[PDB]
């Protein structure tokens, strides 16, 4: 109807309740479930759906062999009903490509897919399910974007892209789209030194993105965007509670304007909700691999370089595989505040489970509760041996 | 449009006509049908659908091994088109969890799913397909609810929950929700001594629930709710025609305010329509197991401790497996009265049929007729041997 | 919107064009297609769909063994998109039972399914997808109905039922329903001596049904109904071009008011369009079995006992299996006349092809053209050997 | 709402961006994907879908054996969601037949399917999903049409048909339909000597069709239609850049009004966008077989007999199989110009890959960009060996 405006603040997060879970790998053992990875969740004014990058083959299909690879001509951004698995028969293709983002502006949806060879990729921006704008690679080195939803404010939907090295300085740009057209773009500014896969959310006319510094940081870079002025700033989460992976053990003091050292050229897409005392960080339990997942309440994590946890909640046990994680919220829910939500990608198969030739995942998603709810762990649930 | 009000009385039940049957286990022998249990039926103003707790795997899938277990992280409340089987491709997830209830208030639907470990479960109340309220376990011992539809009156939808022992006194609460928010809750009152899995229906601004006294009763406890005053009473069906299972043989006089003895710590979800002479009780034919199913007209069963049958109808032969049963009605049908309906869960597999490693069910459902219709029996129809 | 009225006459039939074909058995060899039989086609104001009695199992499923049987608790009337096959995932259950009819009155649809044991069957009449009326068996000997669409005029939808012997006089009734309620019913009148499976159509406020005299007639009985006066007449098609099956060879003079002799206690559901010179009869090519299918223009067939063909069109070769056939028309099409249509059930499996343990069918459907179109034959197309 | 009018001109084509890709053969290796061929794409005012001629069997199905054949009673025009594969469960049958065309006029869709034996075929024209007009074969030698979308202007939708020899002069007709009824038809005029499978598009009240001269031409015949005057002209693309297949090597001067010689009695459906300097031609890279695919910017190709490429883009490598290609545009997109689009049919199986007994394809589709985008190649992606 009218463009949505980020007029509410976040609800108080006292715990996390189960929101969605598709048990895709369990079900796909004996049904036509597509192989995927890089999932996320995004809402329309009347529905919330699961999203992911399909690999263009079912898990039991022979073409599942080799799906550990990230970029192929057989990938596409698909969406499907909440908590259902991504099947051949219920998956709606939003666009073709191996890197994506998508968000609804209140009137209709914008989806972006990047495709092409490493030195000649291009982004196609779709709006109202039609292609509207295209952007060619500017650094000719894997043009790539969020892998989770973007956020809109009065028609303006900022999106973070990176083109260039994954192990040195790269060329990150913040594009401001409206109805799929480019209003403006700016090069990354601030103190974040490397940006990849931003996880964003909005509240009170401000959009916050927690990203991945693949080059040197084990703390996460943060980009805060003003969608009206179409400007931004960047820094790192100050807190010593490190949230990338792999990462060194937690120190007692973090870094606010530089990558916290110890691990180079690697990382995992992640997220956080930075809202004063109502601050919660997500991270893998393991400092070595994408194992387990927990939420930690770390008051003022963004600005306090000595901030430590005051509460927490385990989402996935350290004895279970996790993966990417990102933020989304139902901006069209009732009430006076936006309920923070996130999803965790539960990766199965290669490289951790190499008895199978494929790599896929299932999804688990939670939203915040003002109650202090009891906790459960939520594993993918499949038995690899069944696939042998 | 407007909240539905229970303005009609029940139609006269002179017999039962076939309403729906999904033949899920038969069909699922060679199609992607989800393993389920704890099914029910519930209507929206423009459609009636089947509901159940999925086990997050197909019947032929290898992950079907172990589905005799009731609570796992892979369960979810799903709904699907009337008389179709619950397939991977047509099942809509309403929420995640291992205990549920759901009902439409005339404007939109409220669904409730409980999840978590035994000592830390929580209920999430969804309204208009969005999470609205959460309730943490109060007795830290398997927070659980109806496993069949709730009933609404002018926006108020009462729901019965139990937390605590299944073999001694527990903490049952009646919650009064409106638009997914809690208006009030009260602890169970009256003479019912233990409450589990209430089966409810409404007529003339009163909601009647027939439940399961797992601890000591072979007669069924009854909770009658006033959704306007938001108050209730409880007692037992007085009739000597005992309807739980397992149960002792029928005596000549029942008990009105105490559990009828003979069988402890066990039972099955069941239901009844208590409307003076127009009273009909459902029960398994077997007093020992979930075998067979019959409807018995027992005038004034609720208040007459010597009431015996005056008419009956066999639904499932004693040589066929039955299971849970519950009430629902299409509150949005035409006419001057509400047509009583019920479903019977036809459980197949473990523990009765242990040649297979799974446990699932199909559904059969009937509604009342003012005619005196001929009767047929309605078995699940599948051949276990085909699954070997 | 408003009830449809049969205000148009039939279009001139100069030939038949292909309308729909689902290739169900071919496709079902490797997909989840339900076993069916007794199919038909019926239109809603905005869509035309295929209908049939499912057997509650897929063709490749092990439960397909035994589907030669006509009445079981696993059957149901299902409908699905035009020319798609009846799959587990796209079939919508209209009601439960082993004999049916269905028709749209312009506002909504009425569907009728009969179920139960041979001596205690009952019909449930659904309207607007809700059960409204029930009728108990009156002769306690396989209450049965059309197996093809009924026809409505200003809300009144007549339906022909038969209860009683299939090899002697039976009790046939014409019920006049409106909004699923019984307005009136009358016992069969006229000279038709036995009635089963009527195939009907309407034009100019008159409904014509061509049925099956199972007891003695090889010519087909005809019931003409006035839906306003709610009265009818019956006779036989006078023409010597005999259209039931099995049947004796064609004579030079038929019978107008009595069954044409030669074959007893057997037959096949069939149809015709009786409109003066614009008269076309359908029939199997074989006089011995349900083999082949042809349309013959037989001017004044209904009233001329010496009428012979003046034109024809082969639909299915005598070297291919056919089966039931019936009439339907899209009463909501544009133009000044109703275009006559029909379907032919292409039965595969038992008893003619007993190397497989199942019995199913596919559907082929045609409508009339005012052009004189070239002809093709339309076989089921499946290879039984593939199923071995 | 109102009939669409071709009021815009083509957007400037500076490159081609990926639009859709269904990876049908890859996915169908382990899911119920229908065997097809002769695909295309066509838009409705609110959705764009993939179209193709099904073979009435899945790829893994045993009935896939023999699908190299073009005309059978088991074929049908089906459509399905953009970039999804054509599955048994998501494919909507538009009509029955082995040659087709389809287009939306702004209000509703017209679909045409031709069926029958070679000497007695007939076309049935459907409008608003109902059969409206039928046309009998006029030359009794494989009545055939476009195999890609038609184009409408103010309700008038011209369609090119050919009946007669494929290796000598034939009888081509241009039919002008409106609401599925024939307004007028004319015999082919101009200098094109043989016409088959026209690929059309519209801009500024003119419809341009690039077809296939199967008899003698390696250059492509072009028919330009005035849908208001309902008249046309025909010629050949003058350019020496030859675009049919097989074909001789490119000369330095082409032919404007006669077939360019060198290859007889063969060809492939193809297309082009003829718009002055904004002219782009599609063609297989191989001059011998349906291998590879490229787009070439050939300014004034239609009228300049010496025109050579000034820019290009590879779509499919010469080491990958291609096939048919055709034009379509989303006439209902926003903006001031129509964005040129095309699809390429990626044929797999027989005759090029005869280790399998079937012939099918997948689809890849692109639209133009005003940017100069980097290029990628888009193969079908399946491994034939997996099917052995
Ligand atoms: C029923 O359900 C309820 C609701 O969930 C359950 O109650 C919950 O219980 C949780 C577990 O006990 C609890 O979560 C913990 O909260 C701690 C914060 O609370 C405590 O501190 C504050 C502040 O002084 C007090 O006010 C408060 O009262 C508590 O005492 C967190 O500190 C916990 O997280 C830390 O521990 C877990 C291991 O359990 C780690 O995985 C996590 O990463 C944290 O520890 C690491 O990081 C810190 C920060 O840098 C380091 O100091 C520390 O050494 C650890 O570092 C190592 O490990 C990390 C990760 O592997 C690695 O990166 C690093 O390098 C080091 O190797 C935890 O979050 C909930 O808050 C609580 N909720 C409520 C409402 O009560 C209840 O138990 C359930 N009931 C039953 C019967 O089960
Ligand atoms: C065509 O269709 C029609 C329509 O369905 C068919 O007609 C129906 O026929 C039914 C079966 O005959 C009939 O159902 C029975 O009705 C009895 C009530 O009617 C009779 O009593 C009244 C009152 O005096 C009379 O007015 C009336 O005229 C009749 O005489 C019920 O009593 C029957 O239920 C009892 O029997 C069945 C076994 O058949 C048990 O399964 C059931 O539980 C009841 O019996 C148990 O319970 C009582 C109550 O405590 C005990 O007293 C008794 O000993 C039994 O207890 C044992 O078993 C239970 C269960 O296992 C166990 O818990 C306990 O411990 C003990 O071990 C039955 O309901 C329909 O009413 C009738 N309908 C109509 C409209 O006529 C017709 O036959 C069909 N035609 C054909 C040709 O098939
Ligand atoms: C391109 O397509 C066009 C369009 O379809 C093709 O043209 C069509 O060709 C058809 C076949 O030739 C033709 O159909 C036949 O029409 C006959 C009627 O036309 C003739 O008679 C009239 C009247 O005098 C003339 O005006 C007219 O010009 C013709 O001469 C029918 O009589 C035909 O049906 C009879 O024959 C077929 C066998 O071919 C039987 O299957 C059928 O049942 C009819 O014969 C039986 O029944 C009669 C009636 O009782 C008996 O008299 C007779 O002995 C047969 O009885 C035996 O068989 C039956 C069935 O098994 C059994 O029950 C009984 O006991 C006996 O054993 C036939 O319908 C179309 O009308 C014609 N259409 C047009 C517009 O022209 C064209 O050929 C195609 N082109 C190519 C190149 O292929
Ligand atoms: C990142 O992406 C960008 C964007 O895609 C990439 O840049 C693109 O690069 C393309 C390949 O280099 C280029 O495409 C070529 O363009 C040529 C036209 O440009 C040139 O000429 C003009 C005019 O003088 C100049 O202005 C311009 O600057 C260039 O110099 C075309 O001529 C090319 O097509 C010809 O070559 C290809 C083989 O590469 C053939 O397949 C094709 O059919 C053409 O050649 C045949 O046909 C002609 C015409 O008759 C004959 O003269 C010739 O001998 C060939 O004939 C044989 O082969 C055919 C086919 O098999 C057969 O039928 C015949 O009988 C003969 O056997 C080609 O289209 C893009 O334009 C360019 N785009 C842009 C915006 O720059 C960039 O490289 C990528 N970056 C990286 C790092 O990869
Ligand atoms: C979001 O905020 C903008 C204010 O900028 C609102 O957009 C005014 O809205 C009315 C109705 O659409 C128009 O008459 C104005 O011209 C609108 N736009 C602007 C840019 O001034 C918008 O309505 C708000 N969204 C919601 C849901 O209230
Ligand atoms: C079919 O015929 C009946 C005439 O009997 C029409 O029903 C009059 O229609 C208007 C609008 O619905 C009302 O004000 C009258 O009272 C209607 N009914 C009767 C029974 O008199 C009906 O509209 C016709 N159907 C169509 C499509 O025109
Ligand atoms: C466009 C692309 O390839 N994205 C990939 C991303 C990228 O490699 C990383 O951001 C370092 N540059 O890494 C991962 C990953 O599981 O780690 C998966 C993504 O598919
Ligand atoms: C929440 C839960 O576990 N419910 C289970 C219920 C419960 O055990 C009983 O109410 C006794 N407490 O029993 C049964 C059962 O088939 O008997 C199945 C339910 O899944
Ligand atoms: C209700 C019922 O059984 N109908 C059956 C019908 C019936 O036997 C016949 O009308 C003679 N009475 O016959 C046939 C048949 O293929 O011949 C199939 C139907 O399923
Ligand atoms: C109606 C029909 O058969 N069309 C066929 C067409 C035709 O043979 C050609 O136009 C020469 N006449 O050829 C091809 C082909 O792959 O080459 C496929 C089409 O199915
Ligand atoms: C089918 O059922 C019959 C009868 O029970 C049995 O003899 C036969 O072996 C069965 N065949 C299969 C393939 O199940
Ligand atoms: Ca399968
Ligand atoms: Ca890092
Ligand atoms: Ca009990
Ligand atoms: Ca007969
Ligand atoms: Ca040629």
PDB file of N, CA, C and O in Angstrom, chain B residues 334-354:
ATOM      1  N   UNK B 334     -24.151 -23.119   7.130  1.00  0.00           N
ATOM      2  CA  UNK B 334     -25.472 -22.490   7.073  1.00  0.00           C
ATOM      3  C   UNK B 334     -26.425 -23.246   8.002  1.00  0.00           C
ATOM      4  O   UNK B 334     -26.062 -24.255   8.608  1.00  0.00           O
ATOM      5  N   UNK B 335     -27.652 -22.766   8.123  1.00  0.00           N
ATOM      6  CA  UNK B 335     -28.579 -23.483   8.971  1.00  0.00           C
ATOM      7  C   UNK B 335     -28.723 -22.880  10.348  1.00  0.00           C
ATOM      8  O   UNK B 335     -28.056 -21.900  10.680  1.00  0.00           O
ATOM      9  N   UNK B 336     -29.583 -23.485  11.159  1.00  0.00           N
ATOM     10  CA  UNK B 336     -29.877 -22.975  12.484  1.00  0.00           C
ATOM     11  C   UNK B 336     -29.182 -23.649  13.635  1.00  0.00           C
ATOM     12  O   UNK B 336     -29.342 -23.231  14.776  1.00  0.00           O
ATOM     13  N   UNK B 337     -28.399 -24.674  13.347  1.00  0.00           N
ATOM     14  CA  UNK B 337     -27.716 -25.393  14.407  1.00  0.00           C
ATOM     15  C   UNK B 337     -26.296 -25.769  13.998  1.00  0.00           C
ATOM     16  O   UNK B 337     -25.956 -25.751  12.812  1.00  0.00           O
ATOM     17  N   UNK B 338     -25.468 -26.072  14.993  1.00  0.00           N
ATOM     18  CA  UNK B 338     -24.097 -26.503  14.769  1.00  0.00           C
ATOM     19  C   UNK B 338     -24.098 -28.038  14.628  1.00  0.00           C
ATOM     20  O   UNK B 338     -24.619 -28.758  15.501  1.00  0.00           O
ATOM     21  N   UNK B 339     -23.505 -28.537  13.548  1.00  0.00           N
ATOM     22  CA  UNK B 339     -23.443 -29.977  13.313  1.00  0.00           C
ATOM     23  C   UNK B 339     -22.220 -30.588  13.991  1.00  0.00           C
ATOM     24  O   UNK B 339     -21.072 -30.324  13.616  1.00  0.00           O
ATOM     25  N   UNK B 340     -22.467 -31.402  15.005  1.00  0.00           N
ATOM     26  CA  UNK B 340     -21.391 -32.055  15.729  1.00  0.00           C
ATOM     27  C   UNK B 340     -20.523 -32.902  14.809  1.00  0.00           C
ATOM     28  O   UNK B 340     -21.051 -33.632  13.975  1.00  0.00           O
ATOM     29  N   UNK B 341     -19.198 -32.807  14.957  1.00  0.00           N
ATOM     30  CA  UNK B 341     -18.272 -33.637  14.172  1.00  0.00           C
ATOM     31  C   UNK B 341     -17.177 -34.156  15.091  1.00  0.00           C
ATOM     32  O   UNK B 341     -16.987 -33.654  16.196  1.00  0.00           O
ATOM     33  N   UNK B 342     -16.465 -35.174  14.628  1.00  0.00           N
ATOM     34  CA  UNK B 342     -15.325 -35.718  15.363  1.00  0.00           C
ATOM     35  C   UNK B 342     -14.402 -36.417  14.382  1.00  0.00           C
ATOM     36  O   UNK B 342     -14.776 -36.704  13.231  1.00  0.00           O
ATOM     37  N   UNK B 343     -13.178 -36.660  14.824  1.00  0.00           N
ATOM     38  CA  UNK B 343     -12.215 -37.396  14.023  1.00  0.00           C
ATOM     39  C   UNK B 343     -11.683 -38.518  14.914  1.00  0.00           C
ATOM     40  O   UNK B 343     -11.763 -38.443  16.150  1.00  0.00           O
ATOM     41  N   UNK B 344     -11.169 -39.567  14.274  1.00  0.00           N
ATOM     42  CA  UNK B 344     -10.536 -40.655  15.000  1.00  0.00           C
ATOM     43  C   UNK B 344      -9.182 -40.808  14.318  1.00  0.00           C
ATOM     44  O   UNK B 344      -9.084 -40.802  13.083  1.00  0.00           O
ATOM     45  N   UNK B 345      -8.146 -40.903  15.142  1.00  0.00           N
ATOM     46  CA  UNK B 345      -6.786 -41.083  14.682  1.00  0.00           C
ATOM     47  C   UNK B 345      -6.614 -42.594  14.556  1.00  0.00           C
ATOM     48  O   UNK B 345      -6.865 -43.317  15.523  1.00  0.00           O
ATOM     49  N   UNK B 346      -6.216 -43.069  13.374  1.00  0.00           N
ATOM     50  CA  UNK B 346      -5.996 -44.508  13.137  1.00  0.00           C
ATOM     51  C   UNK B 346      -4.479 -44.764  13.147  1.00  0.00           C
ATOM     52  O   UNK B 346      -3.806 -44.631  12.128  1.00  0.00           O
ATOM     53  N   UNK B 347      -3.958 -45.118  14.320  1.00  0.00           N
ATOM     54  CA  UNK B 347      -2.526 -45.339  14.494  1.00  0.00           C
ATOM     55  C   UNK B 347      -2.051 -46.648  13.918  1.00  0.00           C
ATOM     56  O   UNK B 347      -2.678 -47.703  14.136  1.00  0.00           O
ATOM     57  N   UNK B 348      -0.931 -46.573  13.198  1.00  0.00           N
ATOM     58  CA  UNK B 348      -0.336 -47.747  12.573  1.00  0.00           C
ATOM     59  C   UNK B 348       1.126 -47.773  12.949  1.00  0.00           C
ATOM     60  O   UNK B 348       1.730 -46.719  13.188  1.00  0.00           O
ATOM     61  N   UNK B 349       1.707 -48.970  12.984  1.00  0.00           N
ATOM     62  CA  UNK B 349       3.102 -49.094  13.336  1.00  0.00           C
ATOM     63  C   UNK B 349       3.269 -49.370  14.810  1.00  0.00           C
ATOM     64  O   UNK B 349       2.423 -50.017  15.438  1.00  0.00           O
ATOM     65  N   UNK B 350       4.353 -48.866  15.386  1.00  0.00           N
ATOM     66  CA  UNK B 350       4.635 -49.119  16.796  1.00  0.00           C
ATOM     67  C   UNK B 350       3.682 -48.405  17.762  1.00  0.00           C
ATOM     68  O   UNK B 350       3.178 -47.297  17.489  1.00  0.00           O
ATOM     69  N   UNK B 351       3.435 -49.022  18.930  1.00  0.00           N
ATOM     70  CA  UNK B 351       3.984 -50.308  19.371  1.00  0.00           C
ATOM     71  C   UNK B 351       3.219 -51.556  18.958  1.00  0.00           C
ATOM     72  O   UNK B 351       3.723 -52.663  19.108  1.00  0.00           O
ATOM     73  N   UNK B 352       2.003 -51.390  18.464  1.00  0.00           N
ATOM     74  CA  UNK B 352       1.195 -52.544  18.116  1.00  0.00           C
ATOM     75  C   UNK B 352       1.679 -53.329  16.930  1.00  0.00           C
ATOM     76  O   UNK B 352       1.483 -54.536  16.864  1.00  0.00           O
ATOM     77  N   UNK B 353       2.292 -52.643  15.981  1.00  0.00           N
ATOM     78  CA  UNK B 353       2.792 -53.294  14.780  1.00  0.00           C
ATOM     79  C   UNK B 353       4.272 -52.969  14.704  1.00  0.00           C
ATOM     80  O   UNK B 353       4.700 -52.035  14.031  1.00  0.00           O
ATOM     81  N   UNK B 354       5.056 -53.776  15.409  1.00  0.00           N
ATOM     82  CA  UNK B 354       6.476 -53.521  15.490  1.00  0.00           C
ATOM     83  C   UNK B 354       7.393 -54.130  14.428  1.00  0.00           C
ATOM     84  O   UNK B 354       8.617 -54.122  14.585  1.00  0.00           O
TER      85      UNK B 354
END
